[PDB]
Inverse folding.
């Protein structure tokens, strides 16, 4: 029933039993300089950044290299262009990047206070500029959506200059094959910061790679740990009563060191692009006044695919929504992209065969019971569907119900639909791919020539 | 066709309050 085959893993083998000397616990961060557009667009840079032994990479002065006008993301330019659209804020205690104090101010702790409120771009800008003039608690404007193509056209046009594997949208990007918007992953988000502004510890949604560019005049400090160590970090989180996947925590650095976990630490200056590889655990704090922009990409490597599917199934264990619908994505990739890496091919094809199976079984049981199944085929720009009750992805065979209005329907998985009416009375059952549609797509998906 | 409803998916930092 798993969409993964353990025999196919490509994770690098790492000991952790081998005790590491001090210098291996503070490894250096790969720091690259690009002399030319030619160097930026080489497949060699793609290979370097996605290498599974390379959790995080900083590409120094990339902005200058490709003639990106980062001034289009200054607080001034952004205010001039903004509407009054509401944006979200986090309120936090201002403290040094390697500290997180308890309420007493006498010890370090893992949980990190970061509360939500709302403002506008223009009103956060006044706070940011007034902080800079000096005229302890701070506010961080976070996850500001630059998704409106018309309003943000000049900003977004500048990002088309990036290498393709870094771009928001690309045929080699798994997130460009969702067919719907996932704000902040396949659209750009903006981060407006004062010193002390923190993004606390996480892996990306569904372990996807991340791209982050520092605009504003100040620096950010980054901390990162290889995917290999995430279960140990997750256990400190349990120990200290804060949820790993959805909570707000800041590691105690000496805990990780005591645990034999190497920690990358480095500074991202204005114009530096940070590439976060698949599954890397990281946290970030502004040192000065700055803005950052970031989004996710899903490059076509077997390591990315594996880690996204593993986290998809772990989310399901933990009752957490995967905001990347990996089944839908997997079929779409197979339909439109040639795959020449044998490892990645094997995994996608295994996934599709489990999905084709699951569908066949449950179609069989519905016809056995006389349940009408109607075809509602896919149409351009249609989203992928999730169950209203348990938030699992629901691919192809949909269990829908009506009357809010009599013309809109909610989607459920089979399990949740049967809990609500074990005979499925009042449940309309749809299928978006005929059985032979899936059979033919699967047969059409063959390893391309390298 | 039937209009099938979806929750919008959005990255958002964690929040404690
Ligand atoms: O700029 C930030 O605060 C970091 C956002 C982040 O974690 C990322 O870019 O992956
Ligand atoms: Fe991140
Ligand atoms: Zn469900």
């Amino acid at each position: 029933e798993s969409y993964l085959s353990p025999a196919q893993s490509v994770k690098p083998k790492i000991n952790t039993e081998e005790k590491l000397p001090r210098e291996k616990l503070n490894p250096p961060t790969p720091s690259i300089y690009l002399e030319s557009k030619r160097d930026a667009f080489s497949p060699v840079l793609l290979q370097f950044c996605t290498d599974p032994r390379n959790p995080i990479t900083v590409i120094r002065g990339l902005a200058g290299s490709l003639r990106l006008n980062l001034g289009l993301f200054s607080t001034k330019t952004l205010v001039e262009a903004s509407g009054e659209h509401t944006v979200e804020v986090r309120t936090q205690v201002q403290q040094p990047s390697d500290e997180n104090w308890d309420l007493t101010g006498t010890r370090q702790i893992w949980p990190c206070e970061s509360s939500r409120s709302h403002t506008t771009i223009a009103k956060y800008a006044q706070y940011q500029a007034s902080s800079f003039q000096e005229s302890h608690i701070i506010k961080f404007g976070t996850n500001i959506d630059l998704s409106d193509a018309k309003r943000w056209k000049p900003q977004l046009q500048e990002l088309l200059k990036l290498p393709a594997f870094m771009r928001v949208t690309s045929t080699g990007n798994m997130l460009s094959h969702v067919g719907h918007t996932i704000l902040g992953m396949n659209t750009v988000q903006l981060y407006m910061k004062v010193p002390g502004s923190r993004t606390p510890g996480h892996q990306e949604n569904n372990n996807f790679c991340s791209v982050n560019i520092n605009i504003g005049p100040g620096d950010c400090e980054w901390f990162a740990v290889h995917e290999h160590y995430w279960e140990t970090i997750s256990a400190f989180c349990d120990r200290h009563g804060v949820d790993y996947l959805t909570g707000s925590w800041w590691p105690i650095l000496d805990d990780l060191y005591a645990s034999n976990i190497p920690v990358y630490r480095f500074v991202q200056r204005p114009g530096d692009l940070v590439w976060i590889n698949a599954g890397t655990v990281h946290w970030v704090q502004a040192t000065g006044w700055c803005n950052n922009i970031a989004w996710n990409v899903g490059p076509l490597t077997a390591y990315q695919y594996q880690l996204a599917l593993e986290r998809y199934e772990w989310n399901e264990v933990k009752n957490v929504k995967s905001i990347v619908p990996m089944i839908h994505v997997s079929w779409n990739v197979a339909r439109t992209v040639k795959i020449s890496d044998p490892d990645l091919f094997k995994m996608i094809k295994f996934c599709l065969l489990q999905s084709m199976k699951h569908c066949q079984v449950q179609r069989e049981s519905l016809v056995r019971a006389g349940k009408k199944i109607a075809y509602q085929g896919r149409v351009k720009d249609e989203p992928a569907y999730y169950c209203n009750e348990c938030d699992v992805e629901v691919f192809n065979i949909l269990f829908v119900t009506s009357e809010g209005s009599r013309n809109t329907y909610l989607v459920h998985c089979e399990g949740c639909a049967r809990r609500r009416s074990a005979g499925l009375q009042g449940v309309v059952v749809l299928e978006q791919y005929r059985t032979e549609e899936l059979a033919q797509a699967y047969d059409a998906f063959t390893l391309a020539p390298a | 066709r039937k209009q099938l409803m979806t929750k919008a998916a959005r990255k958002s930092a964690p929040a404690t309050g």
User: Anything to note?
Assistant: Residues 369-434 of chain A form a domain with the Cysteine Rich Protein fold (CATH 2.10.110.20). Residues A 191, 199, 210, 212, 276, 284, 292, 294 surround 2-oxoglutaric acid (ligand 1) (CB under 6 Å). Chain A touches chain B at residues 88, 90, 111-116, 142-143, 145, 180-185, 189, 199-200, 202, 205, 246-248, 296, 321, 323, 376, 379, 383-386, 388, 391, 398, 400, 407-411, 428, 430 (CB under 8 Å).
